[PDB]
Amino acid sequence: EMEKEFEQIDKSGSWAAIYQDIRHEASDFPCRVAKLPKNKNRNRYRDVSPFDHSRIKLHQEDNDYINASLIKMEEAQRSYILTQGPLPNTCGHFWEMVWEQKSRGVVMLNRVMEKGSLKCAQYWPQKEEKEMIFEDTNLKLTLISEDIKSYYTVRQLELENLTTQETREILHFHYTTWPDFGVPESPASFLNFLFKVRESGSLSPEHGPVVVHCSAGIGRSGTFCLADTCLLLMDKRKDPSSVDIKKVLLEMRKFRMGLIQTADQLRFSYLAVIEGAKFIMGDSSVQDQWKELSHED
Numbered sequence: 001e002m003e004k005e006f007e008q009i010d011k012s013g014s015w016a017a018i019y020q021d022i023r024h025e026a027s028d029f030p031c032r033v034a035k036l037p038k039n040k041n042r043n044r045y046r047d048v049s050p051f052d053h054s055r056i057k058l059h060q061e062d063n064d065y066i067n068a069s070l071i072k073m074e075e076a077q078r079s080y081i082l083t084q085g086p087l088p089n090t091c092g093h094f095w096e097m098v099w100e101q102k103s104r105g106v107v108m109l110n111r112v113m114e115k116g117s118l119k120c121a122q123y124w125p126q127k128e129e130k131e132m133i134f135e136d137t138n139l140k141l142t143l144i145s146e147d148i149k150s151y152y153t154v155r156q157l158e159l160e161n162l163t164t165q166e167t168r169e170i171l172h173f174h175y176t177t178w179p180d181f182g183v184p185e186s187p188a189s190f191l192n193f194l195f196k197v198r199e200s201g202s203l204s205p206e207h208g209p210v211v212v213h214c215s216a217g218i219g220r221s222g223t224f225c226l227a228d229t230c231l232l233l234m235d236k237r238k239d240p241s242s243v244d245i246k247k248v249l250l251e252m253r254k255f256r257m258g259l260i261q262t263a264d265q266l267r268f269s270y271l272a273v274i275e276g277a278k279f280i281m282g283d284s285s286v287q288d289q290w291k292e293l294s295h296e297d
C-alpha cells in the first residue's frame with residue numbers, strides 16, 4: 001500500500017515493532033573472512049562485518065579483504081557498494097576497490113568527526129595542491145574542484161592508477177548534515193541530494209556500482225540505498241503501489257547486515273519514497289520545490 005501502510009503505522013505508532021520484525025526476519029550469513037585475526041585492523045566496528053558471499057574482494061594476492069559489500073538488486077537492475085568509512089590503514093584499499101569496481105561516484109553520508117569521535121579517515125585531498133598518493137595500492141588522487149553548498153558538498157577528484165598511468169574522474173557527494181542514528185532535515189533535503197547524485201550519471205548501468213558509505217556503512221548508507229532502489233523500482237514499472245518497501249529492505253539485507261539502523265530511519269525512507277514518487281509519476285515541479293525547501297545556498 002505504501003502511503004496507506006505508513007499512515008496505518010503512524011496511527012498506531014507501531015514503527016518500533018515494524019522495524020524489529022524486519023530485524024527478526026533479516027538474513028544471517030557467515031562473515032568468516034572479516035573475522036580472521038589478520039583482518040581485525042581492517043574493521044572499524046567489531047559487530048559490523050560484510051557477509052562472505054557478497055563481500056568485495058581486492059585484486060591483490062596479499063590480503064583481498066575490505067569491509068565492503070556488493071548490494072546487487074536484481075529486479076531493480078542497480079548495484080551499490082556499501083562500505084565503512086575507511087580507516088587510516090585502509091584508504092589505499094578503498095581507492096583500490098573504487099578503481100577495480102569501476103565506480104564513478106562515492107556517496108559519503110557522515111562527517112569525518114561526529115560527536116567528538118573520528119568516524120572516518122581523511123581519505124580524499126582537501127586542497128588541489130596537496131594530492132594524495134597511496135603507496136600500498138599505487139594510486140594517486142587529486143582534488144580537481146569542489147562545489148560547496150549549505151548542507152552538502154560535491155567534489156571532483158582525479159584517480160590515477162600509477163602502474164598503468166590511466167586516470168579517472170570520481171565524483172564525491174558529501175552529505176554533511178545527516179546525524180548519526182538520525183534522519184535528514186526533510187524529505188526535500190534528502191531527495192534534493194539524491195537527485196544530485198542521480199543527475200551526475202554516477203548511477204548509470206555503464207559504470208561500476210556507486211560506493212556508498214557512512215561510518216559503519218549500514219545505517220545512513222542503508223537508508224539512502226533503500227529510498228533510491230524503491231524509487232527506481234516504481235520508475236521501471238511506473239507503478240508506485242507495486243513497491244513493498246519492507247520487502248526491498250529485506251532483499252537488501254541479504255547482501256549486508258543491519259541496513260537501516262533505527263525505526264525512524266525506516267519511517268524516513270517511507271517518507272522520502274512517497275514524496276519522490278511525485279517526480280517519478282510526472283511532476284516536474286517538485287524537483288524545484290525540493291531545491292528551494294533544502295536551502296542549499
Ligand SMILES: O=C(O)COc1c(C(=O)O)sc(-c2ccccc2)c1Br
Pocket residue numbers: 045046047048119179180181182214215216217218219220221261
Ligand atoms: O549510520 C548510522 O546512522 C549509525 O552508524 C553507526 C555508528 C556511527 O555512525 O557511530 S556505530 C554503529 C554500530 C556499530 C556496531 C553495532 C551496531 C551499530 C552504527 Br550502525
